[PDB]
Design a protein around this ligand. Sequence first.
Ligand code: NA
Ligand code: NA
Lengths: 516, 516
Amino acid sequence: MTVEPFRNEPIETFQTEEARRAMREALRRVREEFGRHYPLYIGGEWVDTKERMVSLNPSAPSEVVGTTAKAGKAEAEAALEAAWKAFKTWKDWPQEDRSRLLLKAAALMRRRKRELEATLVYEVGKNWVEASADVAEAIDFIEYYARAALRYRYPAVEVVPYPGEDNESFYVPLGAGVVIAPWNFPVAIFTGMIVGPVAVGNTVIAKPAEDAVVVGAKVFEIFHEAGFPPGVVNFLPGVGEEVGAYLVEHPRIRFINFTGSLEVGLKIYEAAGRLAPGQTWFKRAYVETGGKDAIIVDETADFDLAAEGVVVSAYGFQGQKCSAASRLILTQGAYEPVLERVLKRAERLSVGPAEENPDLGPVVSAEQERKVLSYIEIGKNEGQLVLGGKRLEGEGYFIAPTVFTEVPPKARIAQEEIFGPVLSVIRVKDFAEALEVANDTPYGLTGGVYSRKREHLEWARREFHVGNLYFNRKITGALVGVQPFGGFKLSGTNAKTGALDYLRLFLEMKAVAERF
Amino acid sequence: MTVEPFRNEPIETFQTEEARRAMREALRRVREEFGRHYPLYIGGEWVDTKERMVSLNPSAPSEVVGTTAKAGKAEAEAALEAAWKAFKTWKDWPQEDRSRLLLKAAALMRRRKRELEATLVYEVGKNWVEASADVAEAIDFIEYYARAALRYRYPAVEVVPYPGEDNESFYVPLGAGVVIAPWNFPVAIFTGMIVGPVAVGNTVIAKPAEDAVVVGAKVFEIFHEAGFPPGVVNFLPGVGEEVGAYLVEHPRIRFINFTGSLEVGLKIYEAAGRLAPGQTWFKRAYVETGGKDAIIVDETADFDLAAEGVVVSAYGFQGQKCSAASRLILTQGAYEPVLERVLKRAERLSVGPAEENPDLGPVVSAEQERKVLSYIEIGKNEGQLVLGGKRLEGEGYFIAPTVFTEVPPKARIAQEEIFGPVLSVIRVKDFAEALEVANDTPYGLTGGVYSRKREHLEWARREFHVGNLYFNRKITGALVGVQPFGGFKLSGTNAKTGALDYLRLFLEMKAVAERF
Ligand code: NA
Ligand code: NA
């Protein structure tokens, strides 16, 4: 099969009247549908339940954006049966056929981009460009994995020949697994985590984050329309740990693909290591578990450029990114000039209902707000609050862009993932100390350096121990294909998304010799 | 760096007078050297201990092949410190330099081939050709991984370009890890499990199997002579669980490479899933955990060819292989002709001291002998004993080639890995039933089919669910490069040895972007 070379889906900036008009139209359609109910999707059909889940607007939490069905263990077992039944034949599809199915799904998603963006705006409080980046990335994952999967097609393995024999090695999919998706990229990462394993012959049971069940269902409408055979992909929104735990611990779950908090990732990995009664394999678990990401700026940097990149990195989607700059490490000569610019830029950021395209919408839920406010309280004892640090007026979960300075490297706010608009500024003597401070956390996801000194940049290339490192630019928004995404240390298992290597994680190899 | 394309090291058959003469002299010199003491190897030096371990000749257990130092927790910690210290600079060696070091080690091993084979004969009771295949495979691992490592060299990752930026993805080694090696291939697999990680910049603490500590020490002599920097490879023979448990559970062990029993493998995988106090990463654990491997024969096969291949697969190295044919599955039309041929061939097999180059030497230890004899007692009550089934006379651990027939597919002797010269013959209606029975174990390592029917071979290609499948030939002796080796299900994690993919397991990826 021959398609155009992969390119990334353009991220809409809404600079044209037509773009703005199209968004307003999408926002109107989506809100007119706030009354909709979305069932489970199991074995190729929408399956409702007696109990339901409610999805709220974080910019107006008294407003319901939709309701969904609620899976328990029984529906989890039904989905598992459907997934294994589907696997028996889905595994035998030619790779070209599976890749075409994905390409169809990408084309349908592209055609519904505005509707999906507008759903992210209302359901998770993304502003317009954050919303567009999320959906574009989801399209990218489907387009990239469709093509990348062909690189593994029968028989892909390079082997040494032997006289009088055919020696053939080839990959085969694992089976049925469970995807446990995050709320902060509930189209992009939700889609990527499902379609990567599915592209090469696996089948998947997907549990959306509670906060983003509506947009998850809409992605499944796309899967349904694309025509994935029954049981290949399944959708199980649920409350609390019931569904996820049942599947993670199940003897017949073959793999687990997880993105979310370290607390939960650690439990998943530990459970994956155990042989459940009657289990007949070693479970694979892929976890991406967040970061405490730093930007270093030294005295040679373009300070204006640095301040812009820090502000985008720290406060983009309200700092609710595993990639967010939550630490700003400044050498002596960079401290005053950089901090002053960061403060001036940050104090101008607007915060309000996401649909108005503010610089920041609200945090995602009452629980997120509680967590972020609690860390702000901790931060008041550990550093010097110099900007924000409070809830803003309205029922929406609006929190001001927050900055603490003179933060000790080993402070709780300098070590623990806050996942909100809170930046900790750390002052260091020189570049060597900046690297030491950058490295001394349990995590290793993203990092950045602003500097004009080549020796400092190339030193960081070698020694700033993070999976995704960026020089003289923002540290968020890794692009599929361009920047393989995934970390070191307690940021997870280094499963690089948007990379050729990702699909190998969902395959095993068979070696077959015939002696003639 | 440019070297000749990889070829496998030829396996000596000892058919020429020159080869016999060389081998007799090598065996004489090794025997003359019985009783020699080998210390631990830690941070570039041989380090002795007060306690010692004894290695016996399984063909004449009153004979002490040698003794070694015995490591406990303190020596394990000293080795870990040395391995992390070495890692700091070893990771920074150009890949060409590391690869050249492996090539030197291969050249030195090649020059000591006869001595190592003779050490295997005396220490683990391999006959001459089994010893030669073992050493040749060790040489192959070093040659193969030296070349394969270069395919991963800076910056190896294929990424999509982006305007105005350099995007550079590359691999880095993980750190210091522990190797727990088996007694049955204590040159080949001991070597491969160590030099693979080490090739790409990792460092290793290696624990030899208790029964094979002398040959492990000799491999370390080669490593020391080759000039691996201090700390890069470390040798810790020990008794029982102490050293292995201490390292597997350690917060500062980065990875674990294991080959041995399912029982032990399951505990290792479970422990690697836990975060030890102060641990700052998700451990990787690679395990290869044995098999219950079948050869299917149908009525279309060459029955004499099948019987030869079955006897070799079942009884080579006394059936003490993860790859050994421990099940013979015969369709109704093949049952009588193949079984009669197998019986006639097996009853002619010689058994005696390994130095005599018999068809079968002894099993490896008194405990192994006990276990195998216990399973023979179990088998007598499950199927029909038709050959052997007893210990022979002599102090060496000699067990007769054993055959049970009309074995129920779910019998313990048809399910559990006996690891001795015991073949279980299962009679089935047809090929479909043969595949069902072949698949219905918890394992998935090796298997074979003797058939002339193309439809049956190609059906097995798709449905006989084992990592290493062979048609119309023996199912043991997978060659490095030619047949990537590793299984499915409870045969382990499908870490394919002697394959390009093996080295990827010991690397993580970094993505570094510079916006100009
Ligand atoms: Na919501
Ligand atoms: Na021994």
